[PDB]
Design a protein around this nucleic acid. Sequence first.
RNA 1: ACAU
DNA 2: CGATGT
Length: 135
Amino acid sequence: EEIIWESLSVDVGSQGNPGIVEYKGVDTKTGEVLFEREPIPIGTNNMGEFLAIVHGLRYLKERNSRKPIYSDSQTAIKWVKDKKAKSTLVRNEETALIWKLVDEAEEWLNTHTYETPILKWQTDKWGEIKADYGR
RNA sequence: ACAU
DNA sequence: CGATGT
Ligand SMILES: [K+]
Ligand SMILES: [Mg+2]
Ligand SMILES: [Mg+2]
């Protein structure tokens, strides 16, 4: 119904899927960029969306912030809820980095607690998420 | 089908 | 058009 403006919004950007993956988190109210991940040479859109949420969780926890996180990714929200990223991406030498980060993000989820609500950004009603890359 |  | 996901 109503955007919760006091929130963090995250999104992935890619060149190819699979392809080069990056992500960022922004203040939903102002668009201020709060974190950005260095591009990862090969990953999937959903792995990036998943890493972006988990990074958001870690970012907010470190700062003692109870703000919710918005993501537009049904998939990544579910993967975080499950603490398991069910990616189809082949595990080989060229995908090792993204899979290391995904594995480490799962590991963080399995060893830490959080109350952060992870909310679906309703793109159909509200337009593009504020963290979008514009491509 | 829906979400990317 | 192609790909990633539930
Ligand atoms: K984009
Ligand atoms: Mg997205
Ligand atoms: Mg986007």
